[PDB]
Each structure stands twice: as structure tokens, then as C-alpha cells.
Design a protein around this ligand. Sequence first.
Ligand SMILES: Nc1ncnc2c1ncn2[C@@H]1O[C@H](COP(=O)(O)OP(=O)(O)OP(=O)(O)O)[C@@H](O)[C@H]1O
Ligand SMILES: [Mg+2]
Lengths: 81, 654
Amino acid sequence: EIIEAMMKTIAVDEEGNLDVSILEVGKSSKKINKIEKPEEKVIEAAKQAGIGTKADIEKLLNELKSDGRVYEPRAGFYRVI
Amino acid sequence: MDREEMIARFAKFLINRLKDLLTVTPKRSLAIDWAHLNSFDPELADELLNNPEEAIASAEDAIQIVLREPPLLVEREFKVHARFYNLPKTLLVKELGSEHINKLIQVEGIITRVSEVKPFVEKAVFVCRDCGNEMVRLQRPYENLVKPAKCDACGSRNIELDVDKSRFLNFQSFRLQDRPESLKGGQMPRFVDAILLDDLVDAALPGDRVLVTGVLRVILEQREKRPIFKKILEVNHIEQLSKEIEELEISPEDEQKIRELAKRKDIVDAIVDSIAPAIWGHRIVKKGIALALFGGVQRTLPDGTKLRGESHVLLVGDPGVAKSQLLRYVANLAPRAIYTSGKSSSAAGLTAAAVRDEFTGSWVLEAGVLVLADGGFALIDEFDKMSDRDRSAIHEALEQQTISISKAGITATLNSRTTVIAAANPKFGRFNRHKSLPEQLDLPPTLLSRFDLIFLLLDEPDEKVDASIAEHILKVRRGEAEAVTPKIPYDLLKKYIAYARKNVHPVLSREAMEEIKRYYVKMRKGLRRGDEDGVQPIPITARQLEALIRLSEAHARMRLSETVTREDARAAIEIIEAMMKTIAVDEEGNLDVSILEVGKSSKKINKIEKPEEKVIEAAKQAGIGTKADIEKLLNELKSDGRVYEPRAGFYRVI
Ligand SMILES: Nc1ncnc2c1ncn2[C@@H]1O[C@H](COP(=O)(O)OP(=O)(O)OP(=O)(O)O)[C@@H](O)[C@H]1O
Ligand SMILES: [Mg+2]
């Protein structure tokens, strides 16, 4: 009951993935990063794809800019490494 | 103390060694035995053990006398360095302490650091502008340079170094450390640095087990502490360890019980169940690790080449599969194994490297796990996390089992004859069944072709396997008997593996060769032309054939048989087939372990795919791939440079 209440009060995921270890939800978070793997073009490409909202895909590519998977080639450009 | 008496006693004791020294002209060193001295005069041995400074010089003068006055006198009084290569007690680096300074000791260990040859000055002749040029100072090789405060002849202070009259000799500096794999229960890596001289210079390589025996000296550092600071072993004689000191020890009844266990039925199943009984399942992984432990026979053809006899295993899996534990139990079960991690804090974790030292800033070569474990195992956890320097030499330390490093003026061809039972993790976080193996692994594609066994420790949410592993975990936590008691005890299994790797050298048989040929020709031409003509999916290669031969010779050694029978070849073939099935390398078994792309669905599509919207529409109407297929194709081309974007909505090729 304590473990059941712990996973509920944290709300790790909508399906129960162990997000305490892998921060990615996995159900609809890690998969989207593989679909993502120009800046004005990839937002329009993700809009018709529906993998994530505008605010969501903005953080998906920016978080990848930290590790370096998705870099910014030029002004308004976004290409994977 | 009675120096003349010591010289007379040494002359009366000293003759076969002197005869052998007089026979060969260029040889100058003389190897004196301590057992001969004990059989002749134990008082001289006690005097040598008391004060080695007045003992080596007196013995040297005495052997020079016995070389001069008796016949066969050499024209020149060349330096005859007394090299005592025996002592009643063989100390260790961990046992060594300050109570052995200024006494002839015999410490054993393994060399980890090595310096270059330097011309150190022995008798520094000090020159001055005024008189007082004959002044000399007998400096020490381990100590630093000393300068006189004033010349006693005339009171002048214009001192200088006369490099013309100074006698320079060879000097080397190494670091003797405790054998980590041979001695790991103590967990004491304390070590003592040592110096080598004109005769002992360039005697051993880093990672070799040597038995050095010299006078433990000491050097003063500064005035920060009143007593001495650091001790430096002045090596008098160096010699490599024998073939029993650096290996396990066995008894006659131990050999008898090992033979009896070998005669026991289902020995292979017992060995597999005896490897890490705590972790449930992974029977194929345990069998592969066992086959890696009983490594194949290492043969050297007369043409000069050396055939490989080490089966490397890579355990790729998602976190939480107890892969790390697998690397802990085998670390203590294997005879010679150094359990390490990928995130190594040392400057040379696995590959040797030339780094600056602290004594004089001189470049010294320091070895790593892949060198100190010569003739053993190296369980490298988190193999995906390696520095860029180590990712360029592991390609040679596996195939050529050697490390040729020449940076910083330190040329050395080390021998990395280690079995790498490693375990890597996917860079994405979890392995995907719909993608290839090197596409999610941080290791380069060429590196994956080295490991003879690549097991996928992928977890699956199946009700049966989850219930089984939960029951096993509850049993191992409750303290159940048969859950932690293997069929073979750990010490006996370790001695068994040692005996098999030392005395059992199986040879191939015509039946096993016929079976291997049949399997190879069955695998070859395995629908290779299918869906790929330019790059037909290759099901197997000669490398993997050599790996299968090594695994077949591993199953014959596991049961202590000198002939690789048909059963061993069939077991190796079954293991290879299970690995190829659980890997899912390609649709038709293409060897993506070298290119990291299947020739049917990845490499073919890439060539027929290499604007953005216009080109994806053209691909869609021509039939190269669907929407997601062309999206992944354009992403791959962007990453490679073939869809780089100069403008918005543009995927031109460079
Ligand atoms: N078959 C099994 N039998 C017993 N325990 C298991 C089994 N599979 C997983 N475990 C448990 O999973 C836990 C984690 O394992 P461990 O940390 O040793 O390796 P790992 O989890 O694979 O490492 P990583 O998560 O970094 O891949 C351990 O406590 C272990 O007991
Ligand atoms: Mg771990």
C-alpha cells in the first residue's frame, strides 16, 4: 500500500513507467524523440505529425541541444547530428 | 666492519658463475646465488642482510680480485655488478614497510609505470673559474642534484658543472605494485617506486610480474617534516616471476578431485548453474560466460603469426537486468580478473598512456586494466563509457592482443592478452527491437565485430518470467538453501578453471571439423542475394567462423577433454544460433556488426534516397518508403550531410 500510494502521489507516468530511473515517460516521450531524430520546417513537420504540441516540441529540440543530438546549423535551422 | 675479512671470505667462496662470466666477453653482470652462500657460509649471508652498503662493494672488490690475480684476467677492470637473485624471504608490496629500509629485501609485484633511460651523473666533478677542479661528489640516482656551498681549496664560490669529466650512467624509474588480480582479497594497492641502473635498465615492461631484489633506500624531500619522506627501492637484481607464483596453487588431492569432477556427468550444466546462482535465468548468458572463462587454446604458427585464443563477451541490456551483478560474481570466480568500470578516474583506465610524473615531470608510461590482467580476464563494466583516447587502441588490444604506444618518446609494444567480458548500455536508455544493435550502442560499428558473443539482456513483461524472477528474489532474500548453494563451490570451481586453462589444450577432431564446415556452408549463401544485390546480406564471415572454432574448443576444455568432439561443436553452434536469434541483427541474418546497417532495408534504401518536401513526395510516389520511412531517411541524410539545409524546407546534398 505504501508503494502503491508512492507511485500515485508522484504520478510518474500515465501508464506507470519507472520514471524514477529513466526520466523519459517512454510511452509517448522516448518514442517521440526517435521520430524527431530547418527549425521553421521541423515545427511544421511536427505539427502535421502530431507527435507533440508547439510548446512541447520546442522543449524536445531544445533539450536535445544540450546533449548535442539536435543542433542549430544556422539562423532558423535545426538538423540532427 | 672487517671489510678486509669480508673481501677475503668472498674471495675464498668465489666459481661456476665466475667461469660463465669469463667465458662470454660482452656480459658484465654476475648472478650470485643466496642458496650457494648459505651452503658455503651463513655468516656472510647474515652480514649481507645486516648492511648491504658495505657488502655489495666488498663483494665486488673481491670478485674483481678473483678475476684479476687468477688466470683469464680481463684486460680492463670492467664493472662487475653483484646481482643477488635469491633471499630466504620473498616480501610483498603490501607487506613492505619502513622496517626494511637499508636492508637487502626481495619484493614481488607487477610493474605499472615505466620511465625512459636517462643519463644520471654518478661522480659529479665540480669545475670552478678559480682552482679546485678535482673536487668530486658521488651523487645518488634517486636523490636530486647537490651543489657545494664553497670550494675548500681556495674559498671560491664560482661553482659550475663539468659535464666533460662526469661519468653518466643509465637510469630508469618504474613503479612496482601489488598484483590486483592475483591478490584482490586484501584490497591493498599500496606500492613502492624503484630505480634501475646501467645493467638493469630496460629490463621489463609495464604489466609484467617481476621479482626485484634490491636495497631499500630513502630520499629526503624538504623541511616540512623532520623524519624521512619517501623510500625508493634501489633494485640490485630484477627477474620475472616463475610460472607458479603469479598463478593459482593446486595440491595432488585437489587435482584428483578436479579429475573426479570432470568425470562427473552433466559437468557443463553444473558449471553453468554454478556461475552466479543469485541471478535467476540467463542460462545462455551464463553458458557464454563459462565458455569465455575456459578460453580457447592459444597457438603460434611457425610463420610468425599468433592465433587468437580469447573469447570476448559483451552484455548489452536495458538497466535493471542484473547485468552488473553478472560482472561481480565472475570477477571473484575467474582465476585472474580485474573488475573495473568504464568511468575510470585513473589517467589510463584500460589503455596504457604516457603521462607526466611528479618526481621530475618526465613522461612515464602507465598501464591499465587491459595490461595488468595479462593472461587473465578484464570485466569492464559500462563499456559504452570510454574516453576518446581509449576508443582508438582497443581495436588493436583485441584483434592483435597488443598495445603499441610510441607517444611522448616512450616506444613500447605491450601485450594486452586479456579476455574482455564487458557489458554496455544503450545510449537512448532502452533497447528497441525495431532497430539494429549498433544504432543504439555508443560503441563504434567496427568494435562490435570483435566480441565473439554479444548477448542481449533485454527485459520483457511476461507474467511467467516475472513470477519466476520474483519467486527467486524472494527465496534469495528469505535465505533459501538451494538458491545460493551452487553445484560446485567457488574455490573449487576457480581451481578447476585454472587447471583447465593451464593443462588442458584441446585439439580439433575430424568430426567437429566436418560439423563446423557443414554449419558454415549452411549459413553461407543464406539468401544473401535476397532483396540486395549490390550489398547482399552476409549471414556469416570467416571471423565468426574463427569465433565458432574458439567456442567449440572452449566446450572441450570445460569438461577437460583433449579432443574437440562433435558435441562441443554442436553446443557452440547452438549458442551462436541462439545469440543470432536473440540479437535480431537483420531480416535475413545480415552481419550488421561491421557496417551498422542491414543491406536489404537500410543500406539499399539509403542509396536510393541520397529540396525536402519535393524529394520526400518523389520518394513516396516512387516507392522507396512510406511517410515515416522517408522521414527517417531525411533525418539520416541530415545527420550525414546529404540533406543539409541552406534554406527553409530544403534538403540539398553536400
Ligand atoms: N534474474 C534475476 N535474478 C535475481 N535478481 C535479479 C534478476 N534480474 C534482475 N535482478 C535484480 O535487479 C537488480 C539490479 O541489478 P544490477 O544493478 O546488479 O544490474 P543492472 O540493474 O542490470 O544494472 P543497470 O541497471 O545499470 O543495467 C539487482 O538487485 C538484481 O537482484
Ligand atoms: Mg549497474
